[PDB]
Design a protein around this ligand. Sequence first.
Ligand code: ATP
Ligand code: ADP
Ligand code: MG
Ligand code: MG
Lengths: 464, 463, 506, 73, 48
Amino acid sequence: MSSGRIIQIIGAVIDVEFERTSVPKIYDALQVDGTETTLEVQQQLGDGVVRTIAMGSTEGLKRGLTVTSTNAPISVPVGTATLGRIMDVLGRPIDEAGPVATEERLPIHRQAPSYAEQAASTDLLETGIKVIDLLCPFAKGGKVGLFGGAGVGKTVNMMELINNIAKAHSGLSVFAGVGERTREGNDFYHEMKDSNVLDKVAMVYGQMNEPPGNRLRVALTGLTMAEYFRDEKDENGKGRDVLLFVDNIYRYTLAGTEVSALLGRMPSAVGYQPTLAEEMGVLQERITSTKSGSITSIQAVYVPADDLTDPSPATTFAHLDATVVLSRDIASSGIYPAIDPLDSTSRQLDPLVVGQEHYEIARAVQNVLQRYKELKDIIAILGMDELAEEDKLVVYRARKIQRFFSQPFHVAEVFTGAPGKLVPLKETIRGFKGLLAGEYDHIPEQAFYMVGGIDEVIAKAEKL
Amino acid sequence: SSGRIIQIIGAVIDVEFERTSVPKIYDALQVDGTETTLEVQQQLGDGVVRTIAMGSTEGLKRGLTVTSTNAPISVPVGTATLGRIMDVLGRPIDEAGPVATEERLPIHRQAPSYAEQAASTDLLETGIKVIDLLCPFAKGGKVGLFGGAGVGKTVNMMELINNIAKAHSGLSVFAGVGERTREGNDFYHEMKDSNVLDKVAMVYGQMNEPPGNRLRVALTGLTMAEYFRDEKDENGKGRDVLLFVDNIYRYTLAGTEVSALLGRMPSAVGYQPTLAEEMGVLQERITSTKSGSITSIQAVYVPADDLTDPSPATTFAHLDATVVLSRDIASSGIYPAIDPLDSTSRQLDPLVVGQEHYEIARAVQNVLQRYKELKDIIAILGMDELAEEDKLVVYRARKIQRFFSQPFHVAEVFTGAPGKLVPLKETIRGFKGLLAGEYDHIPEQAFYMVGGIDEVIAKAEKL
Amino acid sequence: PSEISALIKQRIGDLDTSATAKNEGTIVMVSDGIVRIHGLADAMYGEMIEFDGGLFGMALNLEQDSVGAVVLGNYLSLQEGQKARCTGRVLEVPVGPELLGRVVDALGNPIDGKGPIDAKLTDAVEKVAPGVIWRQSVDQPVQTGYKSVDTMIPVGRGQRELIIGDRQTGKTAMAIDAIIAQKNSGIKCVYVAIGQKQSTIANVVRKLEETGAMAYTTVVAAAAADPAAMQYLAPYSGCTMGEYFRDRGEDALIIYDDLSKQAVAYRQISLLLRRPPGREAYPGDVFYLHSRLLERASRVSAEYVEKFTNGAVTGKTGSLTALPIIETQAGDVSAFVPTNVISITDGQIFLETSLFNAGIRPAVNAGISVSRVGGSAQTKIIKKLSGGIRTALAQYRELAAFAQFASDLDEATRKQLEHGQRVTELMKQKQYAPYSIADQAVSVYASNEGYMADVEVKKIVDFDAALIAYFRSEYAPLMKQIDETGDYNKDIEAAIKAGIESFKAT
Amino acid sequence: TTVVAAAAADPAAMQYLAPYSGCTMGEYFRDRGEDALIIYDDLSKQAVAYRQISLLLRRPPGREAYPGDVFYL
Amino acid sequence: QSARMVAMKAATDNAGQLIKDLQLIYNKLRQAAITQEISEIVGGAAAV
Ligand SMILES: Nc1ncnc2c1ncn2[C@@H]1O[C@H](COP(=O)(O)OP(=O)(O)OP(=O)(O)O)[C@@H](O)[C@H]1O
Ligand SMILES: Nc1ncnc2c1ncn2[C@@H]1O[C@H](COP(=O)(O)OP(=O)(O)O)[C@@H](O)[C@H]1O
Ligand SMILES: [Mg+2]
Ligand SMILES: [Mg+2]
């Protein structure tokens, strides 16, 4: 018969026996016959008995209660209507916007793309954030870890990213909240709501309070979302590219460690799920650019124990295509975005990749900034007077670079009425290389604050 | 009578036996299909016991038949085993025909009695400054090369074999234990270039071999040497026995490999609990007795370069002659890289070494000790902000370090500079002259990678 | 059209012509591609295992009443009770020269999607090392297209030499260059991808076919997402394919990439078998587990070739050279697995983080990087010109180290420092910049002749390149002659210094 | 105000369970549309006791003998 | 005065490099210890 009954449960573990003729395969959906609790097939304990974890609470439930199968893994709806809705792990409405209209659903646990499906080329992913555009340029199917503390508009940063991707290239965006600090999630919802960006992104949060399994699986949930969206192709083929932001995959690792303990198998060397690398690859290699269409992913990450030798960041670095860090003092200097420009690094920093001239200009700029940091200490301890003249020029020009980095945003535009800044590559570089000639030493550093292109800078200098 | 295979895990086997016939704990068990052989280890009882295999574990199924020899592993023994290359079974690998003699000897035996030990009181001059200075030897003692991976455990042995071999005349044996095949073959050909090739015998149990083979590999050669020491010359006794161990750590490692499969427990790190007793059993059958003299050299790999590991710790309880290598000294390019301090010798006796030897050595170690101590502050502070005598001692010790740096006769392979053999008298006089400060005006470069003090004079005046 | 019809008809008239006697065992327990099967007694340890799903298995545990085994691929379509048969035959893999220009499954199945390829020979994967009486001393060079590498750290045919460094510090690019060097040599070269990103994979590929190297070349891949079994097993298979030509008296070359992943994957798998671990979760055999594979590469005797091919050859000594890869955490050379592997290799190379951070590409920590063989493969020119220069610069490193907290420097220290600076700048090259022998030959000549301690610090490399141009233009027959031979004559160096003066005049 | 006590001499179970109770009583007045505040004391010893129980419950050991469910809790 | 500043700057540099040394030492030692007690726990649990 197509259902079984509860035979034993401990902790988060559930056991049910079946007949030998009907027993599901792994990951298939199992609904508790009598409540809304759902069970995920994990491994076959034999004797008609199989082990599963329930999605949701563990009470209200006692042995002998029947539980059925769907003989299929978790299938959650996919469609354009998914935008603007916040859903549970099971893709069930939690914004109280009614049930999702789209009944077109797809399975989750699915195979990574083929070798043939590996996009045969690599090319620079673009955006409007000059420091991103130059100091850490991205590529489609990109994976960058984010670093920093709290109080810098990380959310705001993402908002501008989504606005730009939906504007320039109509690239879609989805977010997954893993271990969300519920209040912060609500606040972020309101924030993305006042901004009309709400309509352009799909929302599911895994609140840390939940049973660790669903918290684990929300990742693949949003992953499948993005897969469908990119594979959702307009005319002429070549569907749009999609963007994914993942909330602190470190929390995901923690949940994996939890559930690893839950099965009651071996805790690893430092103590982790030993299979962590495999599920890493499950995540990563399922995300890239395709032969037609791409999905790029930007992921929050916290470093436990502030160490770079514990396993989690080590495994993480196997996939971080670039490094982006946020510095507190930079925000304290009113510089926005408050990204530390000098130390965030991109693997995609080769003249082979970024372009020869582009590479040279970037190298020179970072050299200048490095020099300036070597200088400002001697300045403060000895006054700006005691420097060589070229040293002073470097000081002023680098500070001009920092000011030029300061820019308003279209997200800031609604926040405080002021036209946002949109700037591509080869638009920044012209002004930068001109600055390398020192042709703006007459131009005050103030003429670079909260400004877009170098033409706008010179216009400001005119009005100033 | 015969047995049948019932389970296969890794490299450990179990077999069913008739209630009438249960072979003793140590016997050869022939695979009735192949050449594969088995040794018993555990009496699992109820007509079933546990064993390991020697050779490949493949081509083996369950229920297959195996006989017993009713005889433990007893291998061919005698001088007809010299100049030959044997397996772990003591069978030719050189393909120079089967061995001639018919005498066999079991690999297992109890240790010799207390009433049989000997006073190894015979020194040795080698030609390596640090060794003959710091570690006087007893002809018949145990010589271990404590060192990490790639510190020069093999090199230090090759050069000694050169020097030792040429300075000696008589029996000698080598047994490759779990090492790179290339180095072993190269050594074999080098020995073939020599002629004591005849005087010696070869056997290689190498890393490629299965761990069952890897375990009882030393037993062969050690038993060989024990015989030859007990093999008395007519109107005389046994001869001077040259023994050379190659990473007994490999044997320890195999014991670790097997213990869990043996139904055994995991030591404080994971070793077999029985590691100490088996190491002692191994070592005790190694001694120069009232009969004959046995001289043993031990290759001592050090896991992760750690001393506090249980195995080295146990090892010191076994080695009268202790020689230790360092990674940082090699990081300084000093070849060899033996640490002066920890490598010690119980032969270091003023009534034995002569007063001047003793006191000069002690003063040297004292100087090095202060230098190492002050290393911290000199790293922190400026070298100039120190007392003058302190700085003098610093330069003294550095020049001492350099004066230890010596080219070796086989070391010219990676350098080209001709190796040296420095008589102990030159060493003593040169070190005393340094400690006298007769050379404080001499550039430190004049002492690097040299031999005797006269070489130092030539280098300095050249410079 | 109809040709496929005739082919399929005759392939159908070919086989399945009769029933077959066989033995089955059904599933008992499953977890993570690790399964418990009961009912097969005729089984072989690690044999191929038949399954209705079309996949296969390798046998692990021969207990009294069942077997545990390992999947080869994913297993989500598997469940207890299904049918599971035995091949009665050991693990194998197709091997042949046909593999050239192809990248396939870790079980030799074309992932390129360029048609399946038959290999008239197939060989078991797990094999043992040859006999000592068949080994041959390394005597033949291998060129790396480098100055720093080829000179200070010689590597000959058949040597094993680990490469160790950090992330994005230049670990592979080096091996790649070495392979490209072998283009003209025509030696056998083959590389294995082991648990890395397919993006990186296709990058390597596209580079290779750009070079056109992927015609005397074969590569197989273990994807980072593939279930750990293939990661564990693949390097053995790659060694198996490589040994084919060494088994034919033909020198061979293998490149192992990131054995660390394979090591940890095996650790995990074996631990899932609940076996007790040693230090940092690694079991003991891991040392053996890798080393046994490593020993399979060596330079062997033509006599061994004859013993292998029993008349099928005239007898030439074969070899296989090994390129393993292990990464170091925070530059911990003393790390456990590194300590294990260094005890195995015939030598090692380590790359310094800061110099690559300082832009030095490559960035050698020559301080600890040596070969057991050393000067048994270099050309007499190279071998005589080298010999202590690596030691000299190593001591220059420590001199500079000591020369920062002391204000006194004698003329010996002064000269050592100043010449170390020049030679340091002398050891630079570009990515994909190979060298002919005369290149580094004249460079080191100039260095030893002090012809560099005289010219501008920065202009060193410019002088070098312009010198190469100067000579290979004017002296092209000269360098052609010298590099075609590898032998030095004094009149040759007379011509060299004549060119030295002429170019210094320019 | 009110206080609930889990003395050190008490059996570990009640100590383990009390904080949730006090939470429930607080939520009462949260559910009463008003506001109040709660203080949580010695959660470390609470975890200690819970670990001991789990051990006596034959539950699989965790890092520092802590099954991961503690963070969940 | 100048030379005192130089010497004290050098002292600062020495302290910084040692500081890096100590973070690395602490990290490895902590990892090793943690793994060690984990080994003890897993050994103990296997008993009963
Ligand atoms: N000679 C060189 N000059 C300049 N850059 C170089 C040189 N050699 C290698 N590189 C650069 O080193 C960078 C990092 O090395 P690469 O990404 O190829 O592999 P890797 O060091 O093994 O790192 P991973 O851990 O990602 O595998 C490459 O992007 C390459 O361009
Ligand atoms: N006497 C020496 N002087 C200088 N360098 C040496 C000397 N011996 C060895 N080296 C180098 O150090 C390496 C390690 O030597 P080896 O004895 O083989 O180490 P291991 O303990 O691993 O067996 C050698 O391959 C050689 O390159
Ligand atoms: Mg060694
Ligand atoms: Mg790489």
